[PDB]
Design an enzyme around this catalytic site. Sequence first.
Site, mmCIF file in Angstrom:
data_model
loop_
_atom_site.group_PDB
_atom_site.id
_atom_site.type_symbol
_atom_site.label_atom_id
_atom_site.label_comp_id
_atom_site.label_asym_id
_atom_site.label_seq_id
_atom_site.Cartn_x
_atom_site.Cartn_y
_atom_site.Cartn_z
ATOM 1 N N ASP A 1 -3.945 8.604 3.626
ATOM 2 C CA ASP A 1 -4.381 7.985 2.798
ATOM 3 C C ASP A 1 -5.282 7.758 2.473
ATOM 4 O O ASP A 1 -6.653 7.588 2.810
ATOM 5 C CB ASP A 1 -4.004 6.811 4.251
ATOM 6 C CG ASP A 1 -4.527 5.206 4.633
ATOM 7 O OD1 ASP A 1 -4.394 4.512 2.926
ATOM 8 O OD2 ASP A 1 -4.284 4.428 4.958
ATOM 9 N N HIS B 1 0.534 -0.959 -0.646
ATOM 10 C CA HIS B 1 0.008 -0.105 0.373
ATOM 11 C C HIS B 1 0.720 1.346 -0.443
ATOM 12 O O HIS B 1 1.544 1.555 0.391
ATOM 13 C CB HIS B 1 -0.808 0.042 1.202
ATOM 14 C CG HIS B 1 -2.208 1.022 0.985
ATOM 15 N ND1 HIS B 1 -2.625 1.538 0.416
ATOM 16 C CD2 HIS B 1 -1.924 2.009 1.962
ATOM 17 C CE1 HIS B 1 -3.419 2.471 0.809
ATOM 18 N NE2 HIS B 1 -3.469 2.577 1.688
ATOM 19 N N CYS C 1 -3.885 3.015 -4.896
ATOM 20 C CA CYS C 1 -3.366 3.886 -3.665
ATOM 21 C C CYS C 1 -2.646 4.928 -4.470
ATOM 22 O O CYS C 1 -1.877 5.745 -3.566
ATOM 23 C CB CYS C 1 -2.597 2.852 -2.820
ATOM 24 S SG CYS C 1 -1.881 1.514 -3.702
#
Length: 225
Positions: free
Chosen positions: A132, A115, A184
């Site tokens: 995030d 991630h 991401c």
Amino acid sequence: EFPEITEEMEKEIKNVFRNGNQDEVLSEAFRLTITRKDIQTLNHLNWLNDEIINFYMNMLMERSKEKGLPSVHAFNTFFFTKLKTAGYQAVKRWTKKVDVFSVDILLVPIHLGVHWCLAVVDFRKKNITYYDSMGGINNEACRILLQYLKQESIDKKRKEFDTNGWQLFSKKSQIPQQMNGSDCGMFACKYADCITKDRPINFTQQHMPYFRKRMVWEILHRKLL
């Protein structure tokens, strides 16, 4: 409202997603290289690799420095993970010839397993912020950066870091969230794009196919639209 990719530009994009010389250097800059193989991680819903992210982050840093924009230093993707796991000594090196205190904004791409996320030191706002696109909070990462700034201040300038009014925190879902795990790295890049322009983070998940196509284009021309 978003700059358009003309016909034209898509032709340049399609062409580089084609099969061919994987080593072909498409773009060379900032000590970095973008090949056909790096560019391909921008395709479909492929996971971005570090070369794309670093290259992009350096373009933001290059763009900062034009008039009126906040000045920016981008740390490379390995910096944080080398800092978290090994401490200040193992990275103290990486900032020779760089006065991390003379810019407005520090960009810190954060690699957690598969991630991507982003931390940002903004010296104007006197704060350190974590972003995030999954909505994870990462308290720790901000403290680790604070603690790094401390040891860097002592080391580079012979004075302690002044934490008065300094605020460390994570953005909750006050930022557009991902649906595709693989996006991401794209959220991290695009977060940083808005932030380094002092623009609100206006996009959402639906703009991601467009952003991938655009970044291929931008990287190839070394031009941010």
